[PDB]
Amino acid sequence: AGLLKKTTGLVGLAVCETPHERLKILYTKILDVLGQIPKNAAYRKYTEQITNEKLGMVKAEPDVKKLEEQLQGGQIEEVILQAENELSLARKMLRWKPWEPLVEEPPANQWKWPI
Amino acid sequence: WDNLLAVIPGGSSTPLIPKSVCETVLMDFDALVQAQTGLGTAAVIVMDRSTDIVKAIARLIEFYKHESCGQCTPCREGVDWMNKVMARFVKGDARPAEIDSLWEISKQIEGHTICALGDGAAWPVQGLIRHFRPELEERMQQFALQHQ
Amino acid sequence: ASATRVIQLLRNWASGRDLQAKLQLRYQEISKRTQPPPKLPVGPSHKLSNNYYCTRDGRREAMPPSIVMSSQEKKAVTPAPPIKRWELSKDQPYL
Ligand code: SF4
């Protein structure tokens, strides 16, 4: 927390003045969109393993200055940006649906370099 | 017993034994084997302090070079290589690491030959290396000292 | 060097610094071009004692890519620990 940081050190990236709850209502959203995905999905178990877990201290600890080393994710103003891509990514494999078997096995021994 | 420096136990191929180990051992196949040598043909050769062990097997290893049929390369090449490097050892023209180098090639031609002469050559020099090691170091020390 | 103290003063004042301390050219400080013969060292494995190439087989010791999964509770990991935010240079933090 403390005095609002004038600049985050990355041009284009802006300092958000309400970062803790922005992480909160983002982090709920991936948990929300994860609801559609099946339980057997490998994505979901990994998602919930780091979503509400990392929703933990941000819910508990409110000082973003201490929150830097809570997630080892760098500056908070890009962590919420990173959470945005995770929310974005969750939408992506809501369509890819990758837990089916391979579309096609690799044709003959194409791999196995050298030739 | 004071005079004798070492004794060829049972044959030229069998590594020579010094007084330090041959003070009690019985001349039998089993005791000779555990004495890092062999009874072989019971060709016991006595030799005193006055003679040099290096000049002793010098003529011995020279005879081995004069015999090898040359069929397999380890005996054909190594034994002559042994003769040249050991000829330097007589005067002492080698650094301390050459004894390990001589030991290395001695293990190289040991067993790798078609016949047992190749190892039959390894054993005498191998026994000389393991027993009169300080003698080789001081003989080489005199070589560099007198030819400084 | 040649240059008299008068215009040396002109260079020093106009540039705001003393240039006679170090100049962009060279002088007698350069090592002369007839350096004595060297005695370059020998290799670490140049010993004639145990030196078998069966030990150092850099080309040979390489192994195929290790098979771990092929087409033919759990925990979440990362390819490496996340980076550490390095601190400012103690010598000079802010230019
Ligand atoms: S070890 Fe035997 S086969 Fe080989 S070169 Fe010597 S005598 Fe010939």
Concatenated DSSP letters of B14-29: SPPEETTTTTT--SSH
CA distances from B55 to B68, B125, C35, C40, C58 (A): 20, 12, 48, 38, 43
> What one-letter code names the amino acid at A78?
E
What are φ and ψ of residue C88, in 5° steps?
Answer: -65, 160
Q: B1 and B19 in contact (C-beta within 8 Å)?
A: yes
| Distance, CA of A86 to CA of A66 (rounded, Å) | 22
Alpha-carbon span A47 to A90, nearest angstrom: 9
CB B17 within 8 A of CB B37: yes
Q: Show residues of chain C in contact with A105, CB under 8 Å.
A: 71-72
Residues 6+ apart with CB under 8 A from A10: A75, A78
Residue B38's CB is within 10 A of a number of other CB atoms, namely: 16
Q: Is the dihedral of CA A16, A17, A19, A21 positive or negative?
A: negative
Q: Do A50 and C76 touch (CB under 8 A)?
A: yes
Q: How far apart are CA C95 and CA A53, in angstroms?
A: 40
Q: Distance between CA B118 and CA B106 in Å, rounded? A: 9
Distance from C-alpha of B75 to C-alpha of B118, rounded to nearest angstrom: 5
Rounded to whole angstroms, how far apart are CA atoms B115 and B13?
13
C11: helix, coil or strand? helix
SS3 of residue C54 by DSSP: coil
The span from the CA of B73 to the CA of B114, in Å, is 9
Contact between residue B39 and residue B10 where contact means Cβ atoms under 8 Å apart:
yes
Interchain contact B101–C (C-beta under 8 A):
yes
CB C31 within 8 A of CB A62: no
**How many angstroms does the Cα of residue B119 sit away from the middle of ligand 1?**
10
Q: Record the tokens describing residue B37, joined without a space.
A: 């040598």
Token pair in block for residue B109: 């031609």
B with A: touching (≥3 Cβ pairs within 8 Å): no
Q: Report the C-alpha gap between B140 and B93 in whole angstroms.
A: 6
Q: Which residue in chain A has the smallest CA separation from C76?
A: A46
HSE toward the beta carbon, residue C26, CA cutoff 13 A: 5
A2-6 contacts, C-beta under 8 A, 24 or more apart: A2/A63, A2/A65, A5/A77
Give the integer Cα–Cα distance in Å for A67 and B98.
Answer: 66
Query: Which alpha helices (H) appear in chain C, and where do they start and end?
Result: 5-15
Annotated binding residue B22:
no
A106/C contact by beta carbon, under 8 A: yes
Q: Can you read off the two tokens belonging to residue A24? A: 């909160």
Give every strand in the sheet of B17-18, ordered side by side: B17-18, B4-8, B45-48
Q: State the number of CA atoms in the 13 A half-sphere of C83 facing the CB.
A: 5
B75 among annotated binding-site residues? yes
Binary contact (C85, A46; C-beta < 8 A): no
Dist. CA C34–CA A63, nearest whole Å: 68
- Resolution attained, angstroms: 3.6
| Closest atom, ligand 1, to C-alpha of B118 | 1
- Are the CB atoms for B133 and B102 separated by under 8 Å? no
User: Residue B52 Cα, ligand 1 centroid: separation in angstroms?
Assistant: 28
Count of other CB atoms within 10 angstroms of residue A72? 12
Residue type, B79: V
Nearest chain C residue to A106 by CA distance is C71
- B132 Cα–ligand 1 center, Å: 27
Give all strands (DSSP E) within A45-86, no chain letters: none
Spatial distance between the Cα atoms of A19 and A14, rounded to a whole number of angstroms: 11
Q: Pocket around ligand 1: residues whose beta carbon is below 6 Å from it? A: B 68-72, 75-76, 113-115, 117-118
What is the CA B91 to chain-centroid distance, rounded?
16
CA distances from A105 to A114, A115, C56, C85 (A): 20, 19, 40, 43
How far apart, in whole angstroms, are the C-alpha atoms of residue B71 and residue B113?
9
First to last CA, chain B: 37
Q: Is the Cβ pair C71, A50 closer than 8 Å?
A: no
Helix (H) / strand (E) containing B48:
strand B45-48
Nearest CA in chain A to C86: A74
Sign of CA dihedral B107, B113, B118, B123: positive
The answer to the question of whether B127 is labelled as a binding residue is no
B115 is in an annotated binding site: yes
One-letter amino acid at B45 equals: I
